[PDB]
Design a protein around this ligand. Structure first.
Ligand code: ATP
Ligand code: MG
Ligand code: MG
Lengths: 441, 437
RNA sequence: GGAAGUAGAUGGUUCAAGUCCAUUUACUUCCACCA
RNA sequence: GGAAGUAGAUGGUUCAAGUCCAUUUACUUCCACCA
């Protein structure tokens, strides 16, 4: 019931069992053999090399150390070559930096080429700091492995673990740095209660200061923010979570929640009670990696939200979902239907030439004078948010992300009501609307 | 059919025929006999005394001159007493300054008490500059009185004659100062096309200058703006009217625009086409003079319009109507119905104590973080502008004018649709909506 | 692919566009995919 | 009766509103009712 006993039981959730450890060790042995046989230069890095990986998430990182002189294309060719040669099976899928993902003896492996630099200043490939991260952490993280695993488990259970665009949260490496800086999970959590959007953590200097934004200085590269891709809102969520946990510590904070199946009827009743327009833009998912797709979904949904705000539909929040074959951009608005008529501002009464020009247009209704200015009634070409978005997405597809917008150009549809509640978007609708009691465990 | 021809056909509408001119003289005969009987110091002033009133708009002005020693109360009692004695029929209804309205041999009369002071500066009673107004216009208006009639008829036809709150247009006295200034109706109309909201007209100096506001300076009182009560919008409407007349002169500018009757069903159709929420607050009309009522209706309208704005009902315009029994506050809104759920801004995430208090509130839905701050979903008590206004008027009756607010306190209703279209508000709704035909 | 920045060009909307909606050229940086 | 200003005294709403919604005391003009 006290934190210490909570943390004891939480360890059972985050520490790999021996069987998984063994499986890891054997795959490592086979990998070393295959790599030694190739006469190639490599280093084991990341959480496997440092024993800071989470139970159930074993993945080995092998880095291939190439001459700095190699072209980016040579780095790609050789890296991919070696990767395919040493893995039992493999997939090649990446946004910018080339690497091979695959499996050795049932264990997942990233085989990543990088440049063998003397110093990680003026990095040549995106991943060149990673060998230096490992060397910096290796003799500083000893005996703190399980503190790292607690922080990772805590973050993961609360959906803010990982720096990738799909999460915009805390990387593993960031977790390790925090644990070195504060000494323990408990100390990190206690101090994070006092973090601000201006907090700078400089682990190499042993220092917390104030800057322009939240910045965790990489001890390997003073210019690098390790928390560069942690969103303001996810920072906010972690700070609030640390405050909640200290107030009432519970094993529940390490237990992930999953969305409940909600009947389309609970949904109908909820939307009816809210009195809002709830609708989605649906279109075929571009065949691109997550790290390209997610910022494009984010862009498309903002541009449309922004359209809905300037057209006076009073959008509340938006959300999105990428399924296997489709994407959905979700919106909720306060205004289900607006009037046809609106006001357009004309010139001041003194300005005769400009008043003429304003009055020259034929309208259904007479212009009028109000507070020394001419005004006119005009008519909208749409009166519902759905009609607005049909128009907007048809004509502004191009501004909705490179691949998302091109897909929307080819086909999109607007869905609402039970048709929507039948789409795989109920978790996102529930979160968007702040529906109580729709998640469990 | 050119400009000067239009102006001459216009005279038949503004110049009183000799029979009503005679009607006035023998009422003035009977007035001077009755007043020349109690002694009484009195002086005929106003438009009758300058010969500048409109055809069929004959009212005589008689001013009782009282020594400056007379109290506020004795000016009232003694002045009212003389007015009652001298008039065949009489009514006593006023906002501040006491007078008697009545009839003598079929002619309307005002009997007005005032202080006979030297210099109309540092004024004692509200009406003290009027006899001096007349002493200035005496000769200066001779041979120009028909140009005055032309201007008054032009303003009267366009709903902008009169300085009273019901109108907020041009006073008869102002009309005479303009004709004295510019020389003719035509010259006034020609020049007024170039008036701004900043124009200052000083007749005593004989100049048009640019000042802080529209200020037609009284020659007998340079502190006083004769156009004090002319609304910016009615100035704007006159200036435009002048531009329209000079661009294409017509006798139609001198005839009152037709009432143009619209039946409930056509009005209904138009509202449906606009897609707006159109409704009224109806209540019993306070038994008060117009000059007290109309500023309160304006205030009530504005206060409710501002409520509708901040409640996101997107009001377009408002209007009001006073009948014999009832008053109506009319509104058109872009939003017929709003959602029950809305967003309310909470504190920045760093502020632990305020977040805690923000989150302690009992709500139907879970609060959320957006761009570094907490937000709550909250639930409205009303979802339509009619129910919103019902709540507002019940709760804020006190802020809606002294008497108008008191009447709303005891009873009001919100009315829309066929029921609203049955009410005598059709003129105001058409004006509000810019309805044509 | 997304974001930030600098120096520009253009279309549309409007009585009126440095100001709103978009389109576009160059040079900068950054982030995600490994950590 | 409405409006503008000078010195304030409250209440309500809100996480917090010297900034939102209202209430009130004194002084000081102004406007409409006649012109
Ligand atoms: N041609 C135009 N059409 C529509 N709106 C305009 C136009 N020009 C200016 N505006 C408006 O003015 C904004 C541009 O800022 P700017 O510096 O011109 O102030 P401003 O418009 O002159 O404001 P104000 O008229 O109230 O002084 C725009 O956001 C827009 O709302
Ligand atoms: Mg790994
Ligand atoms: Mg008169």
């Amino acid at each position: 019931m006290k934190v210490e006993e909570i943390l004891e039981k939480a360890l059972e959730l985050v520490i790999p069992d021996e069987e998984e450890v063994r499986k890891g060790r054997e795959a490592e042995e086979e990998l070393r053999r295959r790599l030694d046989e190739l006469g190639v230069e490599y280093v084991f890095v990341g959480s496997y090399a440092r024993n800071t990986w989470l139970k159930g998430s074993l993945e080995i990182d092998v880095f291939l150390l190439f001459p700095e002189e190699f072209s980016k294309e040579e780095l790609r060719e050789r890296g991919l070559e070696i990767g395919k040669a040493v893995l039992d099976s493999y997939e090649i899928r990446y946004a910018e930096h080339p690497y091979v993902h695959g499996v050795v003896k049932g264990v997942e492996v990233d085989v990543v080429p990088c440049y063998k630099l003397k110093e990680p200043k003026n990095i040549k490939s995106a991943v060149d700091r990673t060998p230096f991260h490992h060397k910096w952490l290796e003799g500083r993280i000893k005996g703190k492995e399980n503190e790292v695993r607690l922080l990772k488990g805590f973050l993961k259970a609360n959906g803010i673990y990982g720096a990738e665009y799909k999460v915009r949260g805390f990387s593993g490496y960031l977790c390790e740095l925090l644990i070195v800086f504060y000494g323990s999970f408990l100390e990190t959590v206690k101090n994070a209660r006092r973090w601000t959007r201006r907090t700078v953590i400089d682990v190499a200097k042993g220092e917390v200061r104030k800057g322009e934004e939240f910045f965790v200085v990489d001890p390997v590269d003073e210019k690098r923010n390790v928390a560069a891709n942690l969103s303001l809102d996810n920072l906010a969520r972690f700070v609030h979570l640390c405050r909640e946990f200290m107030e009432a510590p519970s094993l529940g904070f390490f237990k992930p929640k999953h969305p409940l199946e909600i009947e389309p009827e609970r949904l109908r009743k909820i939307v009816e009670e809210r009195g809002t327009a709830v609708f989605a833009v649906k279109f075929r998912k571009p065949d691109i990696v997550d790290d390209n797709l997610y910022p494009q979904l984010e862009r498309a949904s903002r541009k449309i939200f922004e359209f809905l705000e300037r057209e006076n539909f009073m959008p509340l929040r938006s959300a999105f979902k990428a399924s296997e074959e489709f994407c959905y951009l979700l919106f909720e608005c306060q205004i289900k239907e607006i009037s046809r008529v609106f006001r357009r501002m004309g010139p001041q009464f003194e300005d005769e030439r400009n008043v003429k020009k304003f009055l020259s247009r034929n309208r259904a209704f007479r212009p009028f004078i109000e507070n020394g200015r001419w005004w006119a009634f005009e008519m909208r070409k749409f009166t519902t948010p759905e009609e607005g978005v049909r128009s907007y997405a048809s004509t502004h597809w191009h501004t909705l992300g490179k691949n998302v917008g091109e897909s929307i150009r080819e086909y999109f549809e607007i869905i609402s009501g039970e048709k929507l509640f039948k789409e795989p978007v109920t978790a996102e609708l529930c979160e968007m609307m702040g529906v109580k009691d729709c998640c469990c465990q």
